[PDB]
Amino acid sequence: KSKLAKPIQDLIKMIFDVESMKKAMVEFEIDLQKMPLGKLSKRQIQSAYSILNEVQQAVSDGGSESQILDLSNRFYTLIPHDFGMKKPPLLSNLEYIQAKVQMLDNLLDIEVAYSLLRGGNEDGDKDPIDINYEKLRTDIKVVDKDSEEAKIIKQYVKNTHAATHNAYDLKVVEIFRIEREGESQRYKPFKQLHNRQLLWHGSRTTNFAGILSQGLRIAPPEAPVTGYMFGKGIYFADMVSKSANYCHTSQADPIGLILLGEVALGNMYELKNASHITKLPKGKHSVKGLGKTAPDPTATTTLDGVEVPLGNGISTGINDTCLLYNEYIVYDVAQVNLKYLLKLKFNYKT
Numbered sequence: 001k002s003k004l005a006k007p008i009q010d011l012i013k014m015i016f017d018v019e020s021m022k023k024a025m026v027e028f029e030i031d032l033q034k035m036p037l038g039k040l041s042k043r044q045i046q047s048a049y050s051i052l053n054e055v056q057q058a059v060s061d062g063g064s065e066s067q068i069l070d071l072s073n074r075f076y077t078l079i080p081h082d083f084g085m086k087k088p089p090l091l092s093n094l095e096y097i098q099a100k101v102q103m104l105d106n107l108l109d110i111e112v113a114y115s116l117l118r119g120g121n122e123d124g125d126k127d128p129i130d131i132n133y134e135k136l137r138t139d140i141k142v143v144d145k146d147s148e149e150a151k152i153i154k155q156y157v158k159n160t161h162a163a164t165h166n167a168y169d170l171k172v173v174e175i176f177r178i179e180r181e182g183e184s185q186r187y188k189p190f191k192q193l194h195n196r197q198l199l200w201h202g203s204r205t206t207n208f209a210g211i212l213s214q215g216l217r218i219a220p221p222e223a224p225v226t227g228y229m230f231g232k233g234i235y236f237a238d239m240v241s242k243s244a245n246y247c248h249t250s251q252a253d254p255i256g257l258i259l260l261g262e263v264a265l266g267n268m269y270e271l272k273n274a275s276h277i278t279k280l281p282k283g284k285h286s287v288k289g290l291g292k293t294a295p296d297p298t299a300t301t302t303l304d305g306v307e308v309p310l311g312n313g314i315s316t317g318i319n320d321t322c323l324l325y326n327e328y329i330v331y332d333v334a335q336v337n338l339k340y341l342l343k344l345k346f347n348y349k350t
């Protein structure tokens, strides 16, 4: 049997659940009959990004309608969709194209999960759970619910739940201390930076086997820079509320997973509006979208030298901003070191 603690077993089963992978795909409107989980390949996804990049360019620059039609046909042939009894929409709307770029970001992690699942599982001297856990190459440990470490993190969850997102409550079910293989080493150079904070990162449960094995990553070269508000970086938040929304939970499926990573921000390039950033100004290490609400800078604490903005949501002085909450973006995969993974229970007001 499994040597792992029970919570870790339940966590592994959850991140490797095949049924959830299909639900994700059906939600993106993929045709599961023409495109089964086993047909997904990295190459296939790369090409789809490119097609999206080209069509994005034709819409922006007023390319021929014939061009947009041809690109839409090629995309739907590469990734079969099921629109039911309705006609398939063309990739001629920048918002629909953005939705599709996001679907591909998710398919990239689902593909990693399924590949690992069907990998080397022949060993009979190990429990299936134990075998899959090892495939993550991430040391996972249960954080003691009554320790200081856990107290601080629960304070961070409770105090930073935004006002406009109170359509649900959040209960911390379990906290795991995680350490991905070799991540501490690629992150070493950044301990020399100042302004290192403990920030949030939410994602679907179907993305977690990919996140744990590959770590968080920036979209590939093929993806249009336009598919993302502040360019192709890695996004984080200081309000548990903003990140929780990216968990994509519901009343029917209330358990979400969320990350706490140490991110080396250094000198932030503060922006109040979108900017499809490519190059970063000299002397800047990250981007910070300014929001109307942020944790009370008064209550900020430290946890092993890292700033934890656990203060209550207070209104910042800035008004000429499009954002409601702050967003933090780093453009280097080595600028983040994952620390904790929390199992959250979304209680929806009914």
Ligand SMILES: Cc1cccc2c1CCNC2=O
Pocket (backbone or CB within 6 Å): 200, 201, 202, 203, 235, 236, 237, 242, 243, 244, 246, 327, 328
């Ligand atoms: C866009 C954005 C801002 C802040 C946090 C997140 C995101 C999307 C990815 N996951 C997040 O938690």
